[PDB]
Symmetry: D2
Subunit: 239 residues, 4 copies
């Protein structure tokens, strides 16, 4: 029965950057579908923890700067100790820096790239090693952007990193499919979080809009989807 394919009962999902907005939405969405949650945040995710534990699921709350790639192995070791396994990774921790391209600083380049693409690759690598050891496959969900498709303005490192996310998602699928690993991405549109007439849906997107697609991509219901980016954008890219 196909509805069972969406059910994430007994699954363990590690979501970086889930204290608020989109990442919170996705963490709560995965918990609602049955996942226990490991969070990695720089801010304590109390509201998320309350909402996750209120569903009767567990939340392991890890505090770390995701840009420190040497730190990743331990984060995943702790998750594995606490739950026995890690099944799903959502690489949502990210930042944006706005400055005219002609003035753009090296700091505003490095900080964004270090988090939005470099740490995404290395965290995916770290978790994939654990998936392989487990031998039962795994799911990775990266977070792309409309700026994976279009250039935008004043955010060169964000556009670069998000375009890179879409590309590296393809490579990870190509290389790791043999390990039973799916790697896909969600590209949110313009979301009401920390233009409107160009959205066919006529509304801003919300964290709630990412719950369904994230459960879908985290579940057996999307097993033959791999290396692909799915726009959750109210039709932005269509117009």
């Amino acid at each position: 029965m196909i509805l069972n394919s969406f059910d994430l009962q007994g699954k363990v999902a590690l979501i970086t950057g889930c204290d608020t907005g989109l990442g919170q939405g996705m963490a709560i969405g995965l918990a609602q579908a049955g996942c226990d949650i490991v969070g990695v945040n720089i801010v304590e995710p109390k509201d998320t923890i309350e909402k996750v534990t209120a569903l009767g699921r567990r939340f392991l709350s890890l505090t770390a700067d995701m840009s420190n790639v040497s730190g990743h192995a331990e984060l995943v070791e702790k998750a594995v100790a606490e739950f026995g396994h890690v099944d799903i990774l959502v690489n949502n921790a990210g930042i944006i820096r706005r400055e005219d391209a002609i003035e753009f600083s090296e700091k505003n380049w490095d900080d964004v790239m270090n988090l939005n693409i470099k740490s995404v690759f290395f965290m995916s690598q770290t978790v994939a090693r654990q998936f392989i050891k487990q031998g039962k496959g795994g799911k990775i969900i990266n977070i792309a952007s409309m700026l994976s498709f279009q250039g935008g303005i004043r955010v060169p490192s964000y556009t670069a990193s998000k375009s890179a996310v879409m590309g590296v998602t393809r490579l990870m699928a190509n290389e790791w499919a043999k390990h039973g690993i799916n790697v896909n991405a969600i590209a949110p549109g313009y979301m009401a979080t920390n233009i409107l007439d160009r959205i066919p849906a006529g509304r801003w997107g919300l964290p709630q809009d990412l719950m369904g697609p994230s459960v879908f991509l985290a579940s057996s219901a999307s097993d033959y989807i791999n290396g692909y980016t799915i726009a959750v954008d109210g039709g932005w890219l269509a117009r």
Copy 2:
């Protein structure tokens, strides 16, 4: 709770070409998710009917050449009687003709384009009107292809039609989002069906999944795109291809 968003209890789904292969899979998947099915076919979908009814769901079997666009209005009327509404449409009925591009006949062009794109737009329109009348939105799922993205060989009208499907999917979402209608597409990879019956091994080694797709692989994605779980996805094509486009 989010798992309730995938539940299609009480919905009616019209699927074209569901007697076999991919369409059969989507019809059955939609039925398992709670849908009553309306089939439109050239041959009786006997197996599909038995599997849909075995789940305690209803199946209306309509028979028609989908390429006849004047006959679409009636098919939707027949559905609205009996079931009372139509909430979901899957435009899966299609064909392919293989012939060297330099020799390609007008017949092999028209036959493919009439079904694969023309009939798809006009059926979507017909069902869209019904959606608007009903006033509670709706879902359309078109079927794209790897040949919406890549050219292939010896199938100019197929590549043309499937590329056109990806594009009209965008327009229909743009124009009809205001009516609460989501129009998306699934692009299957290389699937084991009648459509694809050592050349095989070269392709297979370029599918990261390492296996042909199956009708079962479209059940999850089709239920997803037919449900509230995908409400902010519109005008978009999702590849279900085992990583083909990634390689």
Copy 3:
């Protein structure tokens, strides 16, 4: 010497739909680069002929409905008889029909598809047969749209046909590239051929027929020999935004 690679002296270009605007621009640009021109139009391209012949180039004006695919072999035979060979095809003849998608007529579907994609495929087939006979390769330039990439509104058959153009361009390259035939497309942006739209064009101006002269000469020349199956946007940055 690379500038020689852009020189189209001795070449013959068949352009459909070149009486005005973009098609006229492309025919003139090709003529400026050295091409003699064969036009196919519904009416005499009088102004285009004047401009081409003023450059010292030949113009053969054929009058026909490009949507009649049974007529193509004759059009190509006439071009080959007049000049001895045909080297370049530009499939510009096209139309658009605007009408709400929910009300869209079958006539406004058929009319647009017959010309914008069906005739494009069959004209390309017709000319490709001639290219293969000649044995010196050839060039096909199809005309795509921003609506090959985006949906638009009120023009279902236009979007269908132009999305199809981008796809069939890929397939024709796949099959014919081995013969030295290059099949590519130009996707013009918003051309002068309101403020809301300009503010989303990075270049901050409408495109002009002259903006297609360089790209069409490039894709018709030796300078683009390893480009095949590809659509090039000439859009002032529209798709980037």
Copy 4:
């Protein structure tokens, strides 16, 4: 008269990585079209200098590590001092590192990203500042890849960087097109240069790729001369933010 639009007489082009292969091809093509050339290389590009000067054009040879973004301004200042202006930038300097993704080292990440995307953005920024000062527009040509479109294997930082090139090309156009600056990219297909040397030595793999190139041949440096001149010229003035594949039909197949 349109052929004049391709003529780069009086123009000055700065090409990074033009000692060999693709970059050398583009430098020579630009020089054949009339450009004086500024090279930025790790060693003196003797062959390229020979060929460019034989055409009657000037070659300013700069030796520098393009990954050092602090040194870019000085490179451009030298160019401007020599010729009075810089009109065209080709961001060709790049590397690739092959290693299983599951094992991929931090070094193989950083070295590739630093050159292939970071330095590309900052060199573009440096030259764009000069274009704005001059007030006569300018051309930037970035170098994408088939791996801007497809994933590949064993080269995560390459795929990341080249996908990022396609994206930043869009943004740079968005911001700078108003100044008559055109930022575009060329995506070479499978070209017979050092980067495909190992691949081409494997007879079996070589044929599997070649059989999937519709043109039925590998690309060569000469195949980028025309497209680079085009993108560096007034003939492409309404093309902006776009990546053009020079791939013999690879992406079409």
